[PDB]
């Protein structure tokens, strides 16, 4: 299993508006690159929804691609 | 805010060699500790219940391991929660 | 399970701890890291980090350690560098 974490990326990627849609790459189970250039991630899943790394802890995948996705950054 | 990957299958097993060797069963610890008797007790009744207990271990510990049985996150422990906790 | 279960865990109360410890003991987590460090490259493993402050007499688990490194390690390269060490401490 685990699947869970990559289902609910490219699912969540998927919701991208720009010409240069979003990007991510799988480098490991738990290991993610996001964005047009970028650094290596941590990804996990905590009961139904995906974390990834940040600095003061962990956050929701949607709050980070709200945060890092240029087509949802307000 | 901090959250990690805990060695619950440690603490899990320890905790099941440590009640089967000191002669107790986990339900009379889990219906002792729900007073009410309604099937859940609280993160923090639980915890409470352990080091009340005096098995070996530590708040810090028991922050984590009370996180990981709730596996709802609706702040209770229950009955099957409990279970497939100790017993997957 | 085998491999660790996703759980809240109260870091910011651990370091703190260790903070006070330290501080209050007349020692720097620098020299600490240095010592651990023998190959003087920047970095020690997680068990090399572990051992450490187990050996240190330190009030603390391994259960807890295994967490707490892994905290320490934002990445997941398997090292904890000096700047992971100081940012974790020092936010
Ligand atoms: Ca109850
Ligand atoms: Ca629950
Ligand atoms: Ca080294
Ligand atoms: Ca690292
Ligand atoms: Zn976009
Ligand atoms: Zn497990």
């Not at chain 2, 959250?3 to 002792?32: G, I, P, Q, T």
Request: charged share 35%.
């Amino acid at each position: 299993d685990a699947d869970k974490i990559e289902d609910e990326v490219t699912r969540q990627v998927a919701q991208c508006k720009c010409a240069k849609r979003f990007q991510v790459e799988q480098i490991g189970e738990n290991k993610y690159r996001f964005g047009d250039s970028q650094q290596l991630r941590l990804v996990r899943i905590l009961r139904s929804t995906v974390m990834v790394r940040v600095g003061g802890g962990w956050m929701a995948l949607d709050e980070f691609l709200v945060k890092n996705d240029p087509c949802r950054a307000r | 805010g901090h959250m990690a990957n805990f060695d619950f299958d440690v603490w899990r097993k320890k905790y099941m060699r440590w009640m089967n060797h000191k002669k107790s069963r986990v339900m009379d610890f889990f219906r002792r500790i729900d007073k009410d008797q309604d099937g859940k007790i609280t993160r923090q009744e639980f915890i409470d219940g352990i080091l009340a207990s005096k098995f070996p271990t530590t708040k810090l510990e028991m922050t984590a391991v009370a996180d990981i049985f709730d596996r709802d996150g609706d702040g209770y422990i229950d009955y099957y929660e409990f279970v497939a906790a100790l017993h997957p």
